Amino acid sequence: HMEIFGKTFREGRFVLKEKNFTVEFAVEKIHLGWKISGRVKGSPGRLEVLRTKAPEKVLVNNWQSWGPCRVVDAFSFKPPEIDPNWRYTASVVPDVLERNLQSDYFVAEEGKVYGFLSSKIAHPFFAVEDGELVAYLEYFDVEFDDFVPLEPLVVLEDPNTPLLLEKYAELVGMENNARVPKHTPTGWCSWYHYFLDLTWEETLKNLKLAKNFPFEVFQIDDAYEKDIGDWLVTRGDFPSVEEMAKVIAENGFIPGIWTAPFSVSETSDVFNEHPDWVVKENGEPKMAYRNWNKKIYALDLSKDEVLNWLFDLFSSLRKMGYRYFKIDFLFAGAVPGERKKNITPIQAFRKGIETIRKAVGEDSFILGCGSPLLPAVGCVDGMRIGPDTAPFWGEHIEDNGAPAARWALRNAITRYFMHDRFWLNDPDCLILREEKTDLTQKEKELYSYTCGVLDNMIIESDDLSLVRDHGKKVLKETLELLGGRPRVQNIMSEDLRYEIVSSGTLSGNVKIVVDLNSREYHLEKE
C-alpha cells in the first residue's frame, strides 16, 4: 500500500543515509493512524516522504488564503495556465503545478487524510505523479550542516472523513501552539463597498452610523495609503494615520487597519530608498506579483534591517491605538528567490510574521490575508481562508481565486475544520446592503447563515446608510447562530450541495443545508 522514505511501510525507528542527505525518523502509532516525524541534515532538496496509490477523488488545498480547497478527479488533471501576474498564489513550487496535480499541506479522500503538521522550514506538498500520490518536503536547495526537524506527516484512517480533518487540525494546533482567542471580534470593514474609492468623508459617515450596529472593530482597508510600502503616509482626504486611530477610538471602536507588510511597489519611497531590501533574481529585484497596475516586490525577511523596519512600523501603529491588523499579500514574503541569508523562503516568512506579532503585542488581533496557511499558525489570531467575497454571487467568475461570493463561501465550507484549531476562520465580510449590490436577499441570507453556523468571524462591509431592516435582521440572526461546534457532513461533495450541522450554538443545535448552484438554503434550529 505505501512507501515511507523509499521503503515499505513499517512501524519503528529508522535511518536513511543518502549521498546528499541523512534522515532519522520514526513511524509511530497515534490515535486513528500514524505519524512520521524525525530530523534531517545535508541537502534534502525535494524530499520524498511517502508514496502510495492515488485515489480517484481527492480534496486538495492551495497553500494560501485565496486558493481553492476542493474535490478534484485525480486522474483527469490537466495543468492550468499560470497567470504571470499571480504566479506564486497558485503555487510556491510552480514547476510542479505545471505538470502534476498539487496539494499543499494536506490531501483527503473518503476515509483517509494525509497531512503535514507544520511548515517551519520546508514547504510540505503532495503531487499526483502518474497514478501515485507522493508527499514531499521542499527545502528549496537550502543546506543544513546539522539536523533540523522534519515537518511531521500524519496518515489517518476512519470512515468519518470530517472527524479526520478535525483531528488533523487539532494536531496542527498543538504542533504550532495555535492562537485561538476565546473572544471573536465583530466589526466593520470598508473594502467591499468602497474598494479603492474610500474617502475619510464617507469613513466618518459610517463611523457615526456604526454605533447602531453590534461592531467592536472599525477597520480601514486599502485606500488610505500613499503607496504600497509607505504605510505611514496618507493620500487624498485622509488625515494622519495617528489621527484616524484617535478619531476611531474616540467613537468607541477598536481601530483596525489594513497593510500588505511584506510588499513594496516599484514606485514606493521605501523601495526607492532601499532597493536592496527585496528578494532578488540574478542580483536584480524579483517581481513577487503585479497589482495596483504596478510591479510589486517582496521584502527579504532574512535581513535584520527589514525586520527592524517592520518592528518599528507595527510598534508605532500599536502606540497610535490600532489593535486590529489585517495583514495581506503575505505570500509575497515567502516567494522563492535570493535572500541575504541562506534560509528557506518559509523560514524567512516566519521571521517576518514573528516580528509583527512581537511588535503589536499580545493584546492585538492579527488577521492574516492572502497568506500561506500552515506557516502562519501560532502567530495569526484569524485567517482569511477563502478568496474575496463580492457584492455579486459570481457565476460568471471561475474558480481561479478572483472575487466572487460563491467561491468565497465554498472555501469557508471546505476549510471549516481549521476553525477554532488553527485560528479563527475569516469567511470574508458579510455584505448586507439593499442597494448597490447584485445580491438577492436569498443569497445574502445563505452566505450569512452559513458563516454563523460555521462559528466563523462576522465582519460587515457596507455603506451602512444602505443597510435597512432586512440586513439588520440578517446580521442579528447570524450572531444568534454562533457559538457551536460545526461540522460539514459531506465534505467530499462534488456538486456544491452541503449539509452543515453545529451543536450548542446560541440557538441550540442547528442544521443548514445549502446548494451553491441554485443559491438555495434550508435551516433548522431544533
In short, what is this structure?
This protein has 526 residues and is α+β, with helices and mostly antiparallel strands.
How would you describe what is shown here?
The chain is α+β, with helices and mostly antiparallel strands. The chain has twelve helices and 34 strands. Helix 8 runs parallel beside helix 9 and helix 11 (441-453) packs parallel to helix 12 (469-479). Hydrolyzes the short-chain alpha-galactosaccharides raffinose, melibiose and stachyose.
Defining traits:
8-stranded parallel β-sheet, Immunoglobulin-like, 526 residues, 7-stranded antiparallel β-sheet, TIM Barrel, globular, 22% helix, alpha+beta
